């Protein structure tokens, strides 16, 4: 509902050879806008949508600076967490972070977050009040005490409340023609007679944005939604998304089943059938 800006950091350790790969991606809602990779020679913060090229080179230099520095913080942090868990230097390990802000009716911050995972598992998270931490295990209590005593919460809070939402507003203005348009699903139902007599009905939703959508199948006699084969929501390749939900129905009974499509790009919910 409210717009958001987020960054996704992935740091991977290299077995017994001291470096660490750092990958960062920037999103405004469900649209990737920036990227950074320190495998590249002379790594830089690079744009990955047309609109962010509105920003001049001052922006790109500064952001490049800050994600290079962040990148070495994550290298050290990898070696530290490997310390806490008493792991060897022969295996590769992963340190991930995601953080971001949602812009509220005020022009201010609705809510914001910062979460950290080690080897794919929850490690530490900032709480809703932006003044306290939640440690996922024994080691994250070490990190937690450290971060309370140093008031790291106020660094992430002043960022979320200040720079994060201000930049979010600017980015929403720059890409006004793409980021503020919710695009509804184009929908239709296909029919596949296939199991001697069972017929497969497949309800498609293509071309929509943002990501979140709901598709369910309903049968005329029953209040609960039907069992269905549902694919994970997937990118179209052009900035939109797509999904389908299918089920097998007895031959001749297709008009008992309805597909229900909910998306915030639609005026009201959509009912659709094999016509």
């Amino acid at each position: 509902g409210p717009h958001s800006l987020s960054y996704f950091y992935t740091a991977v350790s290299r077995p017994d050879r001291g470096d660490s790969r750092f990958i960062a991606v920037g999103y405004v809602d469900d649209t990737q806008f920036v990227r950074f990779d320190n495998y590249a020679p002379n790594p830089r913060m690079e744009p990955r949508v047309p609109w962010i090229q509105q920003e001049g080179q001052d922006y790109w230099d500064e952001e490049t600076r800050k994600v290079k520095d962040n990148a070495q913080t994550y290298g050290v942090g990898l070696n530290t967490l490997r310390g806490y868990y008493n792991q060897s230097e022969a295996g590769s390990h992963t340190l991930q972070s995601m953080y971001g802000c949602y812009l509220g009716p005020d022009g201010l911050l609705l809510h914001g977050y910062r979460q950290d995972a080690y080897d794919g598992a929850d490690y530490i998270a900032l709480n809703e009040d932006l003044r306290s931490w939640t440690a996922a295990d024994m080691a994250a209590q070490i990190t937690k005490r450290k971060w309370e005593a140093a008031n790291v919460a106020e660094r992430r809070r002043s960022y979320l409340q200040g720079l994060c939402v201000e930049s979010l507003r600017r980015y929403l203005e720059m890409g006004k023609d793409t980021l503020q348009r919710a695009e509804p699903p184009k929908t239709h139902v296909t029919r596949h007679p296939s199991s001697d007599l069972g017929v497969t009905l497949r309800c498609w939703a293509l071309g929509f944005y943002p990501k979140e959508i709901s598709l369910t199948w309903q049968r005329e006699g029953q209040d609960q939604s039907q069992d269905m084969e549902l694919v994970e929501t997937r990118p179209s390749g052009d900035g939109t998304f797509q999904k389908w939900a299918a089920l097998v129905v007895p031959p001749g009974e297709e008009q008992s089943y309805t597909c229900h499509v909910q998306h915030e790009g639609l005026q009201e919910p959509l009912t659709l059938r094999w016509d």
Partner: peptide
């Protein structure tokens, strides 16, 4: 704009 992430874990 990025956060500045500088404190050790």
């Amino acid at each position: 704009n990025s956060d500045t992430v500088g404190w050790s874990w």
